[PDB]
Design a protein around this ligand. Structure first.
Ligand SMILES: [Zn+2]
Ligand SMILES: [Zn+2]
Lengths: 99, 171, 103, 119, 104, 66, 119, 60
């Protein structure tokens, strides 16, 4: 319920760089992995779960993308974090993503 | 322990360029972003008319719209203003003229022109009946009234608002 | 019944509540209802402006302060550039522009 | 663009395929020179030049029309101070082969519009 | 002492030409009636000189800014025509030479 | 609307610099010294911050709830 | 008609009897003064020129720079006889400089009789 | 990146319509030839001139 429509959110998440300095040489291309969904051998799951329950305009940033793998994290998590959305009170953004 | 800044600078090997982004240029400017704001009863009347008289004498240190300008001083506050034509440049008083005082008179009495014309007198700086311009204060205030006049009456609370905007000509 | 025990003016449409209070003040020729309306309207205005600043309190405040100081620092930069227009030889003889001056 | 140059996207080349300056600045939009000479939209060229000044100088250039404080030579003088060719030309390298293009290319920021006329 | 203190207050800010005295004041006036009582209750004055060379006509805690804007087309010789003698003495104080209208 | 995550032309992440940019402008850095201090060298990156209009701050004035 | 035009103009410059939108045209060659007050006359403001100086002086600019802080406004430029709404039929009879420093400076005079200047 | 002053009052810097893009005036591959433009595909991938189209259907 941010002021940006979902494709815009998704697009911005796409452009967030991830610290794949090593794991990129391990993972398969998903097109080549033999599993019906994403798996940790061909993807890294991400979650974003943010709701602006306060008056101050919440900045959703790459600091809110929680990886399932401590080595594939958004670069600015390991300076400032990449802004994905600014949220007003009572707006929220819950999504999960795979890289 | 001793630590001179001249010794502090010698601890570094080399730390100490140009600033040409800042240069002032009349065909170039700056930028502008998104803010949020942009372009009844008599016992009450007595106190209300008696408060402004009291509270205007308090200490003032602020301006209504942006309390950033400090005050310097305060100027406290019938009448009959002889209007003048800017072309004829009527010199009713001795201030438009060169001398600071009347070189031809001593008392610029606003003697009436006649009996049927109290406001439309004949104001002239002529202590004699001759050798002065006959400035007939024609009744122009009847169709040119008003404007309030005040003075530094020794820092006193008074008023001397004008009765009419009477205007004289060379009669 | 719901609006009986639950106040409305603190809703997001506080501007509409202010418009309604203004209409009630204007509709009334009695001074008592006009003064009660004026008091209610001033209170609701203060409350709504406080809430607006509280939501404006962070980040919004920062960009307001930067725009307001930017325009003033731009006026300072323009006036210094104006006195920098006094410098000679800032124009070129190779006719990079021309202007009429007839008669 | 703001100068009545109009045209359909004729192809899209990835960043690897677009030509590039010494630094890896590839154009975003490459428009054919033949748009200019019959149309004499020299305001377009001066926009590109002063936009390149503005982007380096780090503040927004003035393009108010009749402002004799602005002229092309004054802009070129500024642009030369940032270490670019004073006329906005640059040596580009062909994205396909990497060879320098023998003609230096006029490249710089210009304000493009996208029109409602999508295909 | 002899300085220009001319002011051209509008209709709603018409200050009483005489000091406030309890033997010259009476209740005759009452959003519609809110502007009516304001005429004879809030409107004696003072003008503050700011550092920026502007001034404001206050009328208490209120502040109306004023410019001493020139009025050479009506440079009337404002004088105390207090009605003595014939037609008043018209004591020569300050020539009214401005059109200062108060505003918020 | 919001700041682009990457400079369209080259690829440098500029989506983590806007609030920094504005904070440096609030330190009254001149407008190009803010960019020099963030680390934007290429004029292609600089026109990301100079040109950006942050309309999301206006869109957030509208209430969904409260 | 040399008194009427100067007085009607003075009154426009004083906003009192004649509202700013009124346009007084003095046809010299044919002895006609035409005054239009009706609606739908397109007009535009012009700086007034008197002798050869503008009436818009550094006072107005300084006051107007602190506007809102002093609640000065464009209406004060109008009501100070500094700018004037001219309309296309009165534009017939203005002599209109285009900037002061260009057109009113002591070159070998083009006219030296400008009544108005482009803003 | 370059404006008239007039477009201050048009409020164009608040509701702007366009992107300052690093244009190059080159013939290059010829797919820009008769009044055409070559765009950067990777810039588009980054959101260059990406837009959204809203169509509203009303029925009562
Ligand atoms: Zn898998
Ligand atoms: Zn870049």
């Amino acid at each position: 319920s941010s002021v940006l429509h979902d494709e815009f959110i998704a697009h911005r998440l796409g452009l967030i760089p991830l610290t794949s300095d090593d794991i990129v040489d391990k993972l398969q291309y998903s097109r080549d992995c033999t599993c019906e969904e994403f798996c940790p051998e061909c993807s890294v799951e991400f979650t974003l779960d943010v709701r602006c329950n306060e008056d101050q305009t919440r900045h959703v940033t790459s600091r809110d993308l929680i990886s399932n793998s401590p080595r594939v994290i958004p670069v600015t998590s390991r300076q400032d974090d990449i802004l994905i959305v600014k949220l007003r009170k009572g707006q929220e953004l819950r999504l999960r993503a795979y890289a | 322990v001793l630590l001179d800044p001249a010794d502090e600078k010698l601890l570094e090997e080399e730390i100490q360029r140009s600033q040409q982004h800042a240069k002032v240029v009349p065909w170039m400017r700056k930028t502008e972003y998104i803010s949020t704001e942009f372009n009844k009863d008599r016992d009450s009347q007595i106190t209300a008319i008696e408060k402004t008289f009291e509270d205007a004498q308090k200490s003032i240190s602020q301006h209504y719209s942006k309390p950033r300008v400090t005050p310097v001083e305060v100027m406290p506050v019938s009448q009959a203003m002889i209007r003048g034509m800017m072309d004829e440049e009527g010199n009713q008083f001795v201030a438009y003229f060169l001398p600071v005082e009347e070189t031809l008179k001593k008392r610029k009495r606003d003697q009436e022109e006649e009996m049927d014309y109290a406001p439309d007198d004949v104001y002239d700086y002529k202590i004699a009946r001759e050798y002065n311009w006959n400035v007939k204060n024609k009744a122009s205030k009847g169709y040119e009234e008003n404007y309030f006049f005040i003075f530094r009456e020794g820092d006193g609370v008074y008023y001397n608002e004008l009765e009419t905007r009477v205007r004289l000509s060379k009669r | 019944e719901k609006e009986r025990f639950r106040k409305a003016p603190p809703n997001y449409a506080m501007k509409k509540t202010q418009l309604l209070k203004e209409k009630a003040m204007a509709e009334d020729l009695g001074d008592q209802d006009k003064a009660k309306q004026i008091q209610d309207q001033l209170n609701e205005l203060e409350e709504r402006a406080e809430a607006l600043d509280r939501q404006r309190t962070k980040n919004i405040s920062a960009i307001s302060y930067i725009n307001q100081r930017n325009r003033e620092w731009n006026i300072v930069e323009s006036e210094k550039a104006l006195v920098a227009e006094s410098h000679n030889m800032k124009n070129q003889q190779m006719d990079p522009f021309t202007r009429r001056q007839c008669k | 663009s703001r100068h009545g140059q109009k045209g359909t996207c004729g192809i899209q080349y990835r960043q690897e395929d677009m030509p590039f300056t010494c630094e890896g600045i590839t154009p975003d939009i490459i428009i054919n020179p033949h748009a200019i000479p019959s149309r004499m939209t020299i305001g377009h060229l001066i926009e590109c030049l002063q936009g390149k000044v503005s982007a380096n100088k780090g503040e927004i250039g003035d393009a108010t029309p009749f402002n004799d404080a602005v002229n092309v030579q004054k802009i070129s003088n500024l642009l030369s101070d940032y270490g670019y060719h004073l006329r906005g030309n640059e040596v580009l390298y062909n994205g396909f082969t990497g060879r320098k293009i023998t003609s230096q290319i006029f490249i710089g920021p210009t304000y493009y519009q996208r029109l409602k006329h999508m295909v | 002492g002899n300085d220009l203190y001319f002011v051209k207050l509008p209709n709603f800010l018409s200050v009483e030409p005489r000091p406030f005295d309890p033997q010259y004041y009476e209740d005759e006036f009452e959003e519609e009636g809110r502007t009516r009582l304001k005429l004879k209750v809030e409107n004696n004055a003072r003008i503050v000189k700011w550092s920026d060379g502007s001034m404001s006509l206050h009328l208490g805690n209120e502040v109306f800014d004023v410019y001493k804007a020139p009025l050479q087309g009506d440079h009337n010789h404002l004088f105390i025509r207090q009605g003595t003698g014939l037609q008043g003495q018209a004591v020569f104080k300050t020539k009214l030479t401005f059109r200062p209208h108060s505003t918020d | 609307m919001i700041i682009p995550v990457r400079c369209f032309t080259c690829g440098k992440i500029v989506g983590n610099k806007w609030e920094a940019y504005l904070g440096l402008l609030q330190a009254e850095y001149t407008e190009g010294d803010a960019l020099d201090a963030l680390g934007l060298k290429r004029y292609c990156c600089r026109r990301m911050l100079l040109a950006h209009v942050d309309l999301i701050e206006k869109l957030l004035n509208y209430a969904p709830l409260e | 008609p040399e008194q009427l035009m100067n007085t009607l103009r003075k009154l426009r410059r004083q906003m009192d009897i004649i509202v700013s939108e009124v346009s007084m045209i003095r046809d010299i060659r044919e002895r006609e003064i035409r005054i239009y007050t009706d609606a739908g006359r397109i007009c535009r403001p012009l700086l007034i020129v008197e002798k050869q100086k503008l009436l818009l002086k550094k006072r107005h600019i300084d006051q107007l720079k602190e506007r809102e802080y002093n609640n000065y406004s464009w209406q004060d430029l109008v009501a100070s006889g500094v700018v004037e709404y001219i309309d296309t039929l009165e534009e017939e009879t203005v002599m209109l400089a285009m900037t002061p420093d260009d057109l009113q400076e002591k070159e070998v005079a083009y006219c030296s009789t400008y009544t108005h200047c482009e803003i | 990146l370059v404006t008239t002053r007039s477009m201050e009052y048009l409020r164009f810097r608040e509701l702007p319509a366009g992107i300052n893009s690093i244009v190059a005036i080159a013939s290059y591959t010829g797919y820009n030839q008769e009044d055409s433009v070559i765009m950067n595909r990777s810039a588009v991938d980054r959101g260059f001139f990406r837009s959204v189209f809203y169509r509203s259907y009303k029925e009562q």
